[PDB]
Write an enzyme that holds these catalytic residues in place. Sequence first.
Site, PDB file in Angstrom:
ATOM      1  N   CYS A 201       0.829  -1.204   0.000  1.00  0.00           N
ATOM      2  CA  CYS A 201       0.000   0.000   0.000  1.00  0.00           C
ATOM      3  C   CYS A 201       0.867   1.260   0.000  1.00  0.00           C
ATOM      4  O   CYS A 201       1.966   1.263   0.559  1.00  0.00           O
ATOM      5  CB  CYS A 201      -0.931   0.006   1.222  1.00  0.00           C
ATOM      6  SG  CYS A 201      -2.127   1.361   1.225  1.00  0.00           S
TER       7      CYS A 201
ATOM      8  N   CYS B 187       0.328   3.869   1.633  1.00  0.00           N
ATOM      9  CA  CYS B 187       0.405   4.308   3.034  1.00  0.00           C
ATOM     10  C   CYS B 187       1.586   3.660   3.769  1.00  0.00           C
ATOM     11  O   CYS B 187       2.097   4.219   4.744  1.00  0.00           O
ATOM     12  CB  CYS B 187      -0.909   4.018   3.774  1.00  0.00           C
ATOM     13  SG  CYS B 187      -1.183   2.277   4.231  1.00  0.00           S
TER      14      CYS B 187
ATOM     15  N   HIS C 197      -2.229  -3.124   7.183  1.00  0.00           N
ATOM     16  CA  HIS C 197      -2.257  -4.194   6.178  1.00  0.00           C
ATOM     17  C   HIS C 197      -1.311  -5.334   6.583  1.00  0.00           C
ATOM     18  O   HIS C 197      -0.120  -5.294   6.274  1.00  0.00           O
ATOM     19  CB  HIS C 197      -1.881  -3.637   4.801  1.00  0.00           C
ATOM     20  CG  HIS C 197      -2.674  -2.430   4.402  1.00  0.00           C
ATOM     21  ND1 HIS C 197      -4.019  -2.488   4.102  1.00  0.00           N
ATOM     22  CD2 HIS C 197      -2.314  -1.131   4.262  1.00  0.00           C
ATOM     23  CE1 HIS C 197      -4.450  -1.279   3.790  1.00  0.00           C
ATOM     24  NE2 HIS C 197      -3.435  -0.437   3.880  1.00  0.00           N
TER      25      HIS C 197
ATOM     26  N   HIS D 229      -5.873 -19.329  -1.188  1.00  0.00           N
ATOM     27  CA  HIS D 229      -7.265 -18.905  -1.122  1.00  0.00           C
ATOM     28  C   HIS D 229      -7.851 -18.564  -2.492  1.00  0.00           C
ATOM     29  O   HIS D 229      -9.066 -18.500  -2.677  1.00  0.00           O
ATOM     30  CB  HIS D 229      -7.434 -17.687  -0.227  1.00  0.00           C
ATOM     31  CG  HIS D 229      -7.275 -17.981   1.211  1.00  0.00           C
ATOM     32  ND1 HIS D 229      -7.954 -18.990   1.847  1.00  0.00           N
ATOM     33  CD2 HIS D 229      -6.528 -17.375   2.183  1.00  0.00           C
ATOM     34  CE1 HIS D 229      -7.564 -18.979   3.148  1.00  0.00           C
ATOM     35  NE2 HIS D 229      -6.716 -18.000   3.386  1.00  0.00           N
TER      36      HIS D 229
HETATM   37  O1  LIG Z   1      -3.560 -16.698   6.779  1.00  0.00           O
HETATM   38  C1  LIG Z   1      -4.197 -16.549   5.737  1.00  0.00           C
HETATM   39  N1  LIG Z   1      -4.156 -17.442   4.703  1.00  0.00           N
HETATM   40  O2  LIG Z   1      -3.250 -18.496   4.797  1.00  0.00           O
HETATM   41  C2  LIG Z   1      -5.106 -15.421   5.509  1.00  0.00           C
HETATM   42  C3  LIG Z   1      -4.551 -14.024   5.386  1.00  0.00           C
HETATM   43  C4  LIG Z   1      -3.144 -13.596   5.739  1.00  0.00           C
HETATM   44  C5  LIG Z   1      -2.004 -14.091   5.096  1.00  0.00           C
HETATM   45  C6  LIG Z   1      -0.726 -13.659   5.472  1.00  0.00           C
HETATM   46  C7  LIG Z   1      -0.564 -12.738   6.500  1.00  0.00           C
HETATM   47  C8  LIG Z   1      -1.678 -12.212   7.133  1.00  0.00           C
HETATM   48  C9  LIG Z   1      -2.947 -12.626   6.743  1.00  0.00           C
HETATM   49  C10 LIG Z   1      -5.402 -14.417   6.585  1.00  0.00           C
HETATM   50  C11 LIG Z   1      -6.800 -13.915   6.801  1.00  0.00           C
HETATM   51  C12 LIG Z   1      -7.552 -14.462   7.849  1.00  0.00           C
HETATM   52  C13 LIG Z   1      -8.844 -14.022   8.134  1.00  0.00           C
HETATM   53  C14 LIG Z   1      -9.450 -13.025   7.363  1.00  0.00           C
HETATM   54  C15 LIG Z   1     -10.818 -12.580   7.636  1.00  0.00           C
HETATM   55  N2  LIG Z   1     -11.582 -12.237   6.574  1.00  0.00           N
HETATM   56  C16 LIG Z   1     -12.835 -11.822   6.848  1.00  0.00           C
HETATM   57  C17 LIG Z   1     -13.332 -11.737   8.124  1.00  0.00           C
HETATM   58  F1  LIG Z   1     -14.576 -11.317   8.367  1.00  0.00           F
HETATM   59  C18 LIG Z   1     -12.483 -12.104   9.137  1.00  0.00           C
HETATM   60  N3  LIG Z   1     -11.224 -12.534   8.925  1.00  0.00           N
HETATM   61  C19 LIG Z   1      -8.703 -12.469   6.313  1.00  0.00           C
HETATM   62  C20 LIG Z   1      -7.400 -12.899   6.045  1.00  0.00           C
HETATM   63 ZN   LIG Z   2      -3.209   1.618   3.282  1.00  0.00          ZN
END
Ligand SMILES: O=C(NO)[C@@H]1[C@H](c2ccccc2)[C@H]1c1ccc(-c2ncc(F)cn2)cc1
Ligand SMILES: [Zn+2]
Length: 349
Positions: free
Chosen positions: A18, A20, A26, A125
């Site tokens: 980003c 920012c 993030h 994902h």
């Molecule tokens: O771990 C992950 N995949 O392997 C996912 C993403 C992430 C990846 C890498 C670093 C931080 C986060 C993690 C994540 C987990 C949860 C959510 C989430 N999305 C929507 C919600 F309402 C609540 N939580 C969004 C993203």
């Molecule tokens: Zn940002």
Amino acid sequence: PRFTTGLVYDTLMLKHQCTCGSSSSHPEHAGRIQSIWSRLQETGLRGKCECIRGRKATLEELQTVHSEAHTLLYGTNPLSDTIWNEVHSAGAARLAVGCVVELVFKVATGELKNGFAVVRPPGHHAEESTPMGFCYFNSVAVAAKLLQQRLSVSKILIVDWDVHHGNGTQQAFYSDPSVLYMSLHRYDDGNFFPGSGAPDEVGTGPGVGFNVNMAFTGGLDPPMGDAEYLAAFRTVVMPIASEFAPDVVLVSSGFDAVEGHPTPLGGYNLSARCFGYLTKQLMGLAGGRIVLALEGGHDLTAICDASEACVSALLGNELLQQRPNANAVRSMEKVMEIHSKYWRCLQRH
Ligand SMILES: O=C(NO)[C@@H]1[C@H](c2ccccc2)[C@H]1c1ccc(-c2ncc(F)cn2)cc1
Ligand SMILES: [Zn+2]
Ligand SMILES: [Zn+2]
């Protein structure tokens, strides 16, 4: 060549960030991989591994998993909580995919023993037309498809020890008996992120039986740890993996299951060392031909520790017996009884 451990990394992946430029706002940030690359250096581990060159994946490759419309949207750039840099994101997402593709193809062709991709953004994902969970293209899935199409690999094993379910990869290989997707993840009866990945989702058509969801249910009461994941490998993963007998092994290596991950981003009490023993158990398969791709893991010290453990395992270095909790046994027993119908070792469970 040097038939040893491989590594891939590119500073141009840092530019998916980003404007920012904040870590907090993030979670999926450039610092996740930069910290890992610096840790592997500081520990001297980079100096022993061969560092291959990464490239941008072609749109023709990306479409082995995704639709053209999707690949053009997030692959080329003319003029809510998921970021997108309009100048550098397209290139970074493609570099992530390509970095894995290059490394995986080296290890598959007996040039390198094994490898570790320090890539971002994540992939597991990402479905055919839809990005979710800070993924855009499914880097691991694309690498498997290419191995099928360009190196005639008969049987690929995808293990996904990220705490969240790889819905994209599951989707990509659901009808495919030549690819076995194994996911160990927090499920909690489908009330976690992403919400999919129920044990009884076992594949379809020709690929019925080749999708295994090791879904932990019961919650953080108590939280899952080293003993419960080790029990999972011991009684579920390695038994079915050994029976499959894959020519290559890919790992959607998310370290978000490690200690110090709050209750949406993880909530488990695994150790960094444990992923070393899991990597070691997997090395026995496919005559050592294994490659780990970075998925999730927000906490920097947890992923830097976990990465150090895995890379050392891949080189062939080293470093208790606790019982799995009632919820892990209950979860494991639900998978075995469903997968007793498709796998010899589990027939009588
Ligand atoms: O771990 C992950 N995949 O392997 C996912 C993403 C992430 C990846 C890498 C670093 C931080 C986060 C993690 C994540 C987990 C949860 C959510 C989430 N999305 C929507 C919600 F309402 C609540 N939580 C969004 C993203
Ligand atoms: Zn940002
Ligand atoms: Zn995750």
